[PDB]
């Protein structure tokens, strides 16, 4: 069990991309993948699923992510 699944992450411009993940892995690992693929530093954005923001230290499973779920990549302001 705990097989790898593919999720979507939609960037601020509207393009979704697939990512192979395991619910056992942390939000921060997904954030590293998104940073690598989008070319945006992982400090510059935050992730949300179904409205709820994703905390880096928790495993993706904590959020009820299912196959082909879409996470939203929100560009963050440093005010």
């Amino acid at each position: 069990m705990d097989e790898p699944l593919s999720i979507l992450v939609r960037n601020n411009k509207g393009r979704s991309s697939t990512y192979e993940v395991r619910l056992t892995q942390t939000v921060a690992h997904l954030k590293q993948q998104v940073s690598g693929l989008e070319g945006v530093q992982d400090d510059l954005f935050w992730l949300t699923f179904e409205g709820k923001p994703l905390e880096d230290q928790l495993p993706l499973g904590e959020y009820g992510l299912k196959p082909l779920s879409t996470v939203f990549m929100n560009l963050r302001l440093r005010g």
Partner: protein, 313 residues
């Protein structure tokens, strides 16, 4: 061997009598320990400490339950983060501006001042007792506890650059938004129509336009076929809505919105002000207040009052 009586707590309501050995640090006896936000872990009990209340981390079942019931979190480190923030926020000033609690500038806290000002202007009921109580005190003018909890819930520290939208995102998770509902329709001339219903937080937040009116009339978005579909608001049931967009020059007209966030700067580094629509337009910049009949500036978030809306489309 000299000892003293103190109380430990995680919520400052339920107190727990302890007898402490004055030859050992608080840390050796309780683990991480805080006195009114100050870390006293490495300190030995002082005579003057007798009968004072100390926060400790939730290190047994009773404290874990008390902490969860009060804060609605079981992150073991939450209390420590709260106390660290509080050690600073208790020293901030909270000026009254046009009847609202603001925050005098310190520690790059403009984003928190704007969030706090916003919170005092929209109908929102928090679920954790900690937030209910702290919000009541903050409206009474003592906002240190509320601000430290905001920092703790958002996992930000004092001094860190903040985003208002992100802060609200974190805070709404801890609000009762269950009876909020949004119905959208997306119409593509190629693909046809798809209705969507959103509930709770997703029902009150939109990123892409500042104008609630434009959202009612329709915004163009990509479809999966590549054409431009139109998304428009079909129905809204909520006490407020939040419309957000990347910061852009936008004209705020008195009486057409509740409050708004202004971001001057660059994504990497920048500054927030708060604009509120009352008898005229007031611009609150921490302790500073100016007013004007018109307004144009770099707006990033606008909040609107709502009750029930149904499109005529």
């Amino acid at each position: 061997v000299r000892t003293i009586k103190v109380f430990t707590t995680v919520d400052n309501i339920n107190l727990h009598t302890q007898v402490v050995d004055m030859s050992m640090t608080y840390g050796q006896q309780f683990g991480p320990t805080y006195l009114d936000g100050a870390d006293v872990t490495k300190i030995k009990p002082h005579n003057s400490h007798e009968g004072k209340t100390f926060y400790v981390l939730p290190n047994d079942d009773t404290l874990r339950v008390e902490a969860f019931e009060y804060y609605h979190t079981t992150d073991p480190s939450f209390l420590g983060r709260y106390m660290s923030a509080l050690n600073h926020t208790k020293k901030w000033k909270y000026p009254q501006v046009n009847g609202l609690t603001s925050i005098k500038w310190a520690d790059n806290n403009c984003y928190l001042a704007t969030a706090l000002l916003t919170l005092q202007q929209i109908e929102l009921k928090f679920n954790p007792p900690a937030l209910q109580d702290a919000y009541y005190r903050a409206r009474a003018g003592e906002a240190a506890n509320f601000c430290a909890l905001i920092l703790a819930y958002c996992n930000k520290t004092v001094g860190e650059l903040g985003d208002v939208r992100e802060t609200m995102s974190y805070l709404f998770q801890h609000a009762n938004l269950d009876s909020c509902k949004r119905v959208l329709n997306v119409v593509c001339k190629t693909c046809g129509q798809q209705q969507t219903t959103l509930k709770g937080v997703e029902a009150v937040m939109y990123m892409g336009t500042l104008s609630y009116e434009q959202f009612k009339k329709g915004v163009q978005i990509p479809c999966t076929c590549g054409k431009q579909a139109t998304k428009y608001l079909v129905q809204q049931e909520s006490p407020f809505v939040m419309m957000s967009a990347p910061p852009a020059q936008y004209e705020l007209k008195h009486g057409t919105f509740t409050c708004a966030s202004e971001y001057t700067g660059n994504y990497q580094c920048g500054h927030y002000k708060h604009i509120t629509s009352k008898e005229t337009l007031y611009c609150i910049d921490g302790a500073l207040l100016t007013k004007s009949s018109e307004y144009k500036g770099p707006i990033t978030d606008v909040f609107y009052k709502e009750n029930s809306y149904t499109t005529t489309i």
